[PDB]
Amino acid sequence: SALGKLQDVVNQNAQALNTLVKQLSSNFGAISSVLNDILSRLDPPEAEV
Amino acid sequence: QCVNLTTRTQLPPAYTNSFTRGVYYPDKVFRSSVLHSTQDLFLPFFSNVTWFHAIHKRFDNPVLPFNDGVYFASTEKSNIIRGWIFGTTLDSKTQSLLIVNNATNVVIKVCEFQFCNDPFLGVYYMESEFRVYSSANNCTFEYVSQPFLNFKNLREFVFKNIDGYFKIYSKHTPINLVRDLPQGFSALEPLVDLPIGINITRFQTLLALHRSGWTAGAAAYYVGYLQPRTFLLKYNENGTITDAVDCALDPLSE
Amino acid sequence: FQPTYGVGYQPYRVVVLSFELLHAPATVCGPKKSTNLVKNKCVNFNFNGLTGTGVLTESNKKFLPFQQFGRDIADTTDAVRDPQTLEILDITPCSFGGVSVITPGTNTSNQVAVLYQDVNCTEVNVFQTRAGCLIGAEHVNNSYECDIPIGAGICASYQSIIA
Amino acid sequence: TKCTLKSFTVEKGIYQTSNFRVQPTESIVRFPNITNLCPFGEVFNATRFASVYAWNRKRISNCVADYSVLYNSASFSTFKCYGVSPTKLNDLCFTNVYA
Ligand SMILES: *[C@@H]1O[C@H](CO)[C@@H](O[C@@H]2O[C@H](CO)[C@@H](O)[C@H](O)[C@H]2NC(C)=O)[C@H](O)[C@H]1NC(C)=O
Ligand SMILES: *[C@@H]1O[C@H](CO)[C@@H](O)[C@H](O)[C@H]1NC(C)=O
Ligand SMILES: *[C@@H]1O[C@H](CO)[C@@H](O)[C@H](O)[C@H]1NC(C)=O
Ligand SMILES: *[C@@H]1O[C@H](CO)[C@@H](O)[C@H](O)[C@H]1NC(C)=O
Ligand SMILES: *[C@@H]1O[C@H](CO)[C@@H](O)[C@H](O)[C@H]1NC(C)=O
Ligand SMILES: *[C@@H]1O[C@H](CO)[C@@H](O)[C@H](O)[C@H]1NC(C)=O
Ligand SMILES: *[C@@H]1O[C@H](CO)[C@@H](O)[C@H](O)[C@H]1NC(C)=O
Ligand SMILES: *[C@@H]1O[C@H](CO)[C@@H](O)[C@H](O)[C@H]1NC(C)=O
């Protein structure tokens, strides 16, 4: 644990990137988190929503 | 044809520890050198798993609930356990699932069987006795496949029924332990997915008699129940689940 | 029935196919069409309902026989099994990158160089850097002070544009 | 760069102006080997058919059916699909078929 100050910064940046990538898996109230599924399942008036 | 077995010895069923058994692969995705948290219908660690015997005079074929899913463990030698019955009322009113492994092949049928009160197979000292159902009128699904199968063999199965899909997971383990479940870890690979689409709340174990009255060969099986919970699974460099953490067992594993 | 009969009295064999769809899982489908596998190219792949865009290369990951797809830590599909021939393919993402323009002042010159960041030079005075592919700058073996920073120890200057 | 910087004069330096994304070329839609075809040969090419008062019924299930070997067969005098388009049969998936 001698080099914990640099490893803390590295872990925080990697965890922020992993959280930002992980947030793509959330649908945020939509029917799906995949854009291709929405564009292939729905008409553009509701796919726009 | 049905036969009442009236030479049983009255004894309450036993209970023992699950240890860290009952873990199956939750999906078909390869993962390597990773720690993955998943929320699924799992068997809890160190749980109270119900123990049934076949010894001579014990012959345990009770009526058990299915609930959300069933972990079925089998400390087996000389091939007494042969299959399972799934359904709701287990008669011709509803539609029921038959899985059997007789002396030739493995048969899965979804029919309205009028089941006997004590369904069984039999071995004469050759297999020449089969008394499971008295009729089968309306059959929707048939599937004939390969044979799935001191106590020498350990059979783990996980039966789940979600969205009309019957998931059977299996694992075969060479053991040399005498009486109880061995303590260790073994992740259950998926065996088959059956599109049966039926309501299942009750299930039956099918055993085999030994004739030379009747004699029950030495076998023992264990029934546990799955609950929705989270495990932390460890995937090694070869993609095999080598260890697991129950997230709601104790504060250390939490 | 005699064979000497006219049309309308001759026998006709009739098969009536009734496709019925109860909310049990459907098990009667058509033939799932397949096309020849193309590797080492940025293609749109559709493997057993899993779709995407990527470069499909050979993989050294040995799957267990029940496993079909592969995911990394960030839950992105980076490995897959071909269903026709049981082989493992890595799905590299198709190359993307920033396009940066390296120039001196327009009072000085109108010559520019283009840096494609994290892009190999075979996928676009062409020089390969660790920052990316630099087109329009002549790489020299001499070392000077940094005028325009490129990155990874590479700098550009005007004297033509050298890197 | 002049468009990005909103200026007609560009100072000396490096300016990130655009992006380059490789674009796809082909579509590869690989599926399993077409196995366990439905036994339509035992229904259409049967030796002995039934009479219409005691018509035979075969429950086609748990298989994959190539319908366009029937619709492209020259032998059939009448081929009338009512609820479904004929060419769309290879794409629609049904729970079971009764022949
Ligand atoms: C084996 O035992 C069971 C339980 O007693 C028998 O099931 C009963 O059979 C009688 C026959 O008239 C019925 O009236 C009861 O309603 C049945 N009970 C249940 C819970 O189903 C069964 O018949 C016996 N087997 C044979 C071959 O006689
Ligand atoms: C398992 O259940 C039985 C009765 O349901 C009980 O007597 C026994 O103590 C339980 N075992 C454990 C380890 O809790
Ligand atoms: C096993 O069951 C199948 C299906 O009922 C049957 O065809 C076969 O004859 C049986 N074999 C024996 C040895 O009973
Ligand atoms: C089920 O079987 C009974 C008796 O064989 C029959 O009367 C009934 O119509 C059948 N139902 C279905 C849905 O096949
Ligand atoms: C399935 O069976 C159980 C027990 O018989 C019953 O309570 C439940 O309502 C059934 N499910 C449906 C959808 O009917
Ligand atoms: C992984 O597999 C290799 C051989 O393929 C073997 O040498 C190694 O011991 C395995 N690792 C584990 C943890 O089992
Ligand atoms: C598909 O066919 C090829 C050769 O025709 C064979 O090598 C391959 O194993 C088959 N796929 C499966 C899943 O058996
Ligand atoms: C019947 O046989 C002929 C010749 O073998 C073939 O062309 C036709 O497709 C068959 N009919 C079926 C498979 O329904």
Curated annotation (Swiss-Prot), chain A:
Listed result of changing N27K? In strain: Omicron/BA.1, Omicron/BA.2, Omicron/BA.2.12.1, Omicron/BA.2.75, Omicron/BA.4, Omicron/BA.5, Omicron/BQ.1.1, Omicron/XBB.1.5, Omicron/EG.5.1
Species source reads: Severe acute respiratory syndrome coronavirus 2 (2019-nCoV)
Segments forming a coiled coil:
7-49
State what changing S40A does.
In strain: Alpha/B.1.1.7
**What role does it play?**
Subunit of the fusion protein that is processed upon entry into the host cell. Mediates fusion of the virion and cellular membranes by functioning as a class I viral fusion protein. Contains a viral fusion peptide that is unmasked after S2 cleavage. This cleavage can occur at the cell membrane by host TMPRSS2 or during endocytosis by host CSTL. In either case, this triggers an extensive and irreversible conformational change that leads to fusion of the viral envelope with the cellular cytoplasmic membrane, releasing viral genomic RNA into the host cell cytoplasm.
- Give the result of D8N, as annotated: In strain: Delta/B.1.617.2, Mu/B.1.621
Task: Report the protein name in the record.
Answer: Spike protein S2'
Q: What is the effect of changing L39F?
A: In strain: Omicron/BA.1
Q: Which residues of the full protein are shown?
A: 943 to 991 of 1273
